[PDB]
Design an enzyme around this catalytic site. Sequence first.
Site, PDB file in Angstrom:
ATOM      1  N   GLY D  76       0.818  -1.192   0.000  1.00  0.00           N
ATOM      2  CA  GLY D  76       0.000   0.000   0.000  1.00  0.00           C
ATOM      3  C   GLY D  76       0.860   1.252   0.000  1.00  0.00           C
ATOM      4  O   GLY D  76       2.082   1.192  -0.161  1.00  0.00           O
ATOM      5  N   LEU D  77       0.185   2.395   0.144  1.00  0.00           N
ATOM      6  CA  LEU D  77       0.746   3.729   0.380  1.00  0.00           C
ATOM      7  C   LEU D  77       1.496   4.266  -0.840  1.00  0.00           C
ATOM      8  O   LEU D  77       2.109   5.337  -0.748  1.00  0.00           O
ATOM      9  CB  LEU D  77       1.689   3.752   1.597  1.00  0.00           C
ATOM     10  CG  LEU D  77       1.860   5.010   2.442  1.00  0.00           C
ATOM     11  CD1 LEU D  77       0.507   5.601   2.757  1.00  0.00           C
ATOM     12  CD2 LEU D  77       2.630   4.685   3.715  1.00  0.00           C
ATOM     13  N   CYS D  78       1.449   3.575  -1.982  1.00  0.00           N
ATOM     14  CA  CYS D  78       2.368   3.870  -3.077  1.00  0.00           C
ATOM     15  C   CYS D  78       2.029   5.185  -3.766  1.00  0.00           C
ATOM     16  O   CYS D  78       2.873   5.762  -4.462  1.00  0.00           O
ATOM     17  CB  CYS D  78       2.354   2.722  -4.083  1.00  0.00           C
ATOM     18  SG  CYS D  78       2.969   1.163  -3.419  1.00  0.00           S
ATOM     19  N   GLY D  79       0.803   5.668  -3.596  1.00  0.00           N
ATOM     20  CA  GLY D  79       0.383   6.901  -4.230  1.00  0.00           C
ATOM     21  C   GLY D  79      -0.663   6.664  -5.295  1.00  0.00           C
ATOM     22  O   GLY D  79      -1.533   5.808  -5.136  1.00  0.00           O
TER      23      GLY D  79
END
Lengths: 140, 122, 73, 104, 131, 104, 61, 56
Positions: D76-79
């Site tokens: 996750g959190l990759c944009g």
Amino acid sequence: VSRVGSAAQIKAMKKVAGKLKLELAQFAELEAFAQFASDLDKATQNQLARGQRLRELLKQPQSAPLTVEEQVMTIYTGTNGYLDSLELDQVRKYLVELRTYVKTNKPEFQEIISSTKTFTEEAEALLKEAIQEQMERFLL
Amino acid sequence: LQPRIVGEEHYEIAQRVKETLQRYKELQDIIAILGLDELSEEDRLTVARARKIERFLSQPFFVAEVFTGSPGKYVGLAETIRGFQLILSGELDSLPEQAFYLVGNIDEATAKAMNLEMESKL
Amino acid sequence: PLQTGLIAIDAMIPVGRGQRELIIGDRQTGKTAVATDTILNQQGQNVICVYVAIGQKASSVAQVVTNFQERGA
Amino acid sequence: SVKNTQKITEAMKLVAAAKVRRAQEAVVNGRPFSETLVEVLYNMNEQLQTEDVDVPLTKIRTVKKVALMVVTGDRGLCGGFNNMLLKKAESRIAELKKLGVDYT
Amino acid sequence: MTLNLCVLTPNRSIWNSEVKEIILSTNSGQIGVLPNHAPTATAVDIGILRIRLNDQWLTLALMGGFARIGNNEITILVNDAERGSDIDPQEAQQTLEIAEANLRKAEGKRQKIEANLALRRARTRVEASNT
Amino acid sequence: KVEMLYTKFVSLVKSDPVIHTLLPLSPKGEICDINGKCVDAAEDELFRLTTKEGKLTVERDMIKTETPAFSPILEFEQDPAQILDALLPLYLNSQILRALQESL
Amino acid sequence: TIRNSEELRGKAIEQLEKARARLKKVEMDADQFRVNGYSEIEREKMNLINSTYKTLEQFEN
Amino acid sequence: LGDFMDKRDASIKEQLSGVKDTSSEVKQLEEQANAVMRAARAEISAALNKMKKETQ
Ligand SMILES: Nc1ncnc2c1ncn2[C@@H]1O[C@H](COP(=O)(O)OP(=O)(O)OP(=O)(O)O)[C@@H](O)[C@H]1O
């Protein structure tokens, strides 16, 4: 902020710097988060190449003020866009070149700007010819 | 440190040292920590010359002879200007990095470099 | 108008005869330079500059006095 | 707290740059495979470009249906990465529902 | 003189050294390759390789590929490659019975392939795990 | 039809999801477009990481090496159509593997 | 091929005469601006000596 | 008649080698215009730097 700024500012600076204030706010807003979306967009790339140059021409040295005709000329040449193809390293050398060129060669622009207290289009045309001459003298 | 107070080329030398140091500061977790995948040519010149300047800045003191073994020398203004003028414009890149460490003038650094090369042939 | 001889000020934040313009900024940021530019831009007009330097350094006020004297101010 | 989040975000940036460096080598660990494969595939057809080849991988089924495998990550959190993949996914499945293609 | 081997996978290169004596399957039959061998492209199916060079043989398990025998270098391009001493013996028998159990649900074109793949794959796991 | 949506290493600043066709393939060792434009003129493969400044950027680094000639007289065994039918699954696996690695 | 080769040689030798004219006359503008800029920079030198002698007299006053 | 065929293609190939020659001269003349023009500006710049350093 200037409460009464428009009242004391003469019409030459108004008609030459309203667009400059617009595109300066626009360049300040295109400054942040600049990369992910507007990476090669023509409008934003042109506004960046003419807004880095906006701040370039908005610089100055200490104890070297420029009187009103130099201000209207230097802001007109930044509002039209005759420096976007130039170098960012060589904006200001071309700036002092065009400044001293109009200071020596062309004696009508100062008289028209002083008298009319506005941006008269005949002064604009002769100024344009001088700008094209200095443009060629610096690009070549 | 103003150009039209102390000299324009002096100010350009100082500002270029600051620029190369601002390069090396941000490039530390770029090349010096993990990646190192041939960062650039122009970046490698700046990193090498930045380490050269960082050896070059520190100098042996008078009062530190009996303290930490350093003979005393004195360095002037235009001398430091010319030293960083040589080091920044990429001329003495071939000398070893510790030839610039703990030295005074730039000619003294070049002399120490030749002594270390006479050691390198030994 | 009373143009300060700056591009940005006299361009988009004008200052008129009777409009107070507070020059608010930190220490060693260029406000004294702004005021001296404003003063030196009045070389020709009927602008009798008055300038008070409350509690400023002696070297600063003497250097600005020297600048005024050399610039014909 | 904001200092600790700052340092751990710099930490994950460092390990992300490290694994990107690793991935550029995981590519060259399969490039010679690829070229030794495709040079055979292409240049050896000169004896077979005359005759009919007739592989089921090369066969033309009558164009009815389409399968659309979207290659998404697991972390996750990759944009905007995963959401851009889903956006191109749903744009293609929207473009495919007017021609009557009955996608999977 | 000695032929050069290249056991390849799409991700890693397992074997790249040489060999003087091999036994490898192909799709129709099998070919045995000794030194100074003419260029012959060999379409290897799912099948292990017996490999000898101044030693007793080894099994190198493959699971479908193709080998372009060049000149003194033979280019064995396979998708799944391994050795029979690494794939577990009794877990390969586990895979064998699992495949022969799950195979009996082959009642479709979609499931004939993914069950016959299980059959031949478990078989070519056991045939290397034993050898 | 089976087609594939995956990303690439165009820039750290722009990720672009392209919907590449996979299973019906041109035999030339190439990929094509979803319409058959044959985008594999836009290979631009095998990046490596390098900079000009403090930020770490992509530098996609167009074509580096290649080593084909051919063999003049193969005279293979194994029934040519079936040789190429046996060679195509490895190439398709190479395309899938490269897709997943570039996505990661 | 006759008319193509004919028109091609004609237009290209015409472009050569135009390149000759452009070269010689832009060199004429160059030689013009050489003398002109020399007069300009030496006029700037006289401007320089006037300004520095003027601030000299200013310090004398 | 074969000689006249040769003369036809000879005139044509004469025009063809002539257009290659004048194209070489074309690129030479345009780079010479650019060279003398930028070089003259470089001369003026170097001369002005020299004279201004000297008078300063
Ligand atoms: N436009 C400019 N170009 C070059 N130098 C400048 C400019 N403006 C200011 N400076 C330099 O910055 C320094 C600080 O300027 P200034 O004294 O106006 O700021 P300040 O905040 O009034 O400083 P302080 O109040 O601490 O004396 C000065 O030495 C001046 O030379």
